[PDB]
Write a protein that binds this ligand. Structure first.
Ligand SMILES: Cc1cc2cc(-c3cc(N)nc(N)c3)ccc2o1
Length: 337
């Protein structure tokens, strides 16, 4: 019986006279993902190997249940989610066989030298991700991904715009509270930072953050920690509404209620732009040739195009989860017309 939690995998070895292990795709907290040739089906697969650890096995069994649940639906919309081909036990590890995809949206930004992709390619990723969120919002699914980020959205093919969402390891269904900290820090919604109840709207917050980054090359809100995260959100969006802060268990982690009942920023121990003064209109460069002026004298980057983009994003970054744009309405926005 091995002492470590990790599976020993040798490049070149063959599993169950079927899977020819080529190479490591990537390592994560769950374990690892290997590229392998399935000699029976004659196709590449990405094998997700789970560590022999109780916490990770439990998360992976939730992931298998939610992916199999999604697979029973007929809609074309389900193809924006990575396809789980099968699962088995091997050398006492749970192994998930997925279709082979291509590189993630972070690798795509790094290949631009973090200068961002075009507004036209941003629109394509936006439309697909809004359709995927509409699929998860199907009542019989009601899945919250809870970990959207550029690294969890993958191109299907290196030369094409088609994308799929991966990793439902942190995911839950509407009304569940399972894990103490959810969402990646940069993509973490204000209701989660404030310790308020969360629903599918947290994923639309994450998507708003991701789409600005895909076009600018840089994260919109790059907090070093939760206080810094909230402060960078406030730079762009101002002080959250009183009706939210008055109900937030963790309001006093970031803010203070003054004698007149209005909220300000909590004093530092002893630096940010004043609240709401880092305008998204200037981050995107709506009137000034897009990010860093670099889109002036290219087509597909008009002031009219940028205003439609800015308006959709600001509806995705609504502080109020009950009024934040829902996937069904985001798809009807003039940005997609
Ligand atoms: C190239 C490539 C990487 C890759 C990664 C996954 C995958 C990774 C994780 N963590 N969770 C899920 N549900 C899928 C699937 C196919 C893949 O294809």
């Amino acid at each position: 019986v091995p002492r470590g939690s990790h599976m020993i995998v040798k490049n070149g070895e063959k599993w169950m006279d079927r899977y020819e292990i080529d190479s490591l795709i990537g390592k994560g907290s769950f374990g690892q993902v290997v590229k392998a040739y399935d000699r029976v089906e004659q196709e590449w697969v990405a094998i997700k190997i789970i560590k022999n650890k109780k916490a990770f096995l439990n998360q992976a069994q939730i992931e298998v249940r939610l992916l199999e649940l999604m697979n029973k639906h007929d809609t074309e919309m389900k193809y924006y989610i990575v396809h789980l081909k099968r699962h088995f036990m091997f050398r006492n590890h749970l192994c998930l066989v997925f279709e082979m995809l291509s590189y993630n949206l972070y690798d795509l930004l790094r290949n631009t030298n973090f200068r961002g992709v075009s507004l036209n390619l941003t629109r394509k990723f936006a439309q697909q991700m809004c359709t995927a969120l509409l699929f998860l919002a199907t009542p019989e699914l009601s899945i919250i991904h809870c970990d959207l980020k550029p690294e969890n959205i993958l191109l299907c093919n290196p030369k094409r715009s088609a994308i799929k969402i991966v990793d439902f390891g942190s995911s839950c269904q509407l009304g569940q509270r399972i894990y103490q900290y959810i969402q990646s820090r940069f993509y973490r919604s204000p209701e989660v930072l404030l310790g308020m109840p969360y629903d599918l709207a947290i994923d639309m917050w994450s998507l708003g953050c991701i789409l600005v980054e895909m076009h600018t090359g840089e994260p919109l809100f790059s907090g070093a920690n939760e206080v810094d995260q909230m402060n960078k959100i406030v730079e762009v969006l101002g002080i959250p509404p009183a009706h939210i802060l008055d109900q937030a268990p963790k309001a006093r982690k970031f803010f203070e209620k003054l004698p007149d009942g209005t909220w300000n920023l909590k004093k530092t121990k002893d630096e940010y732009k004043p609240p709401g003064t880092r305008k998204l209109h200037n981050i995107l460069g709506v009137e000034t040739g897009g990010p860093g002026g670099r889109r002036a004298g290219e087509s597909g980057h008009t002031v009219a195009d940028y205003l439609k983009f800015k308006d959709l994003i600001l509806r995705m970054l609504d502080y109020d989860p009950k009024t934040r744009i829902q996937p069904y309405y985001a798809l009807q926005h003039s940005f997609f017309a």
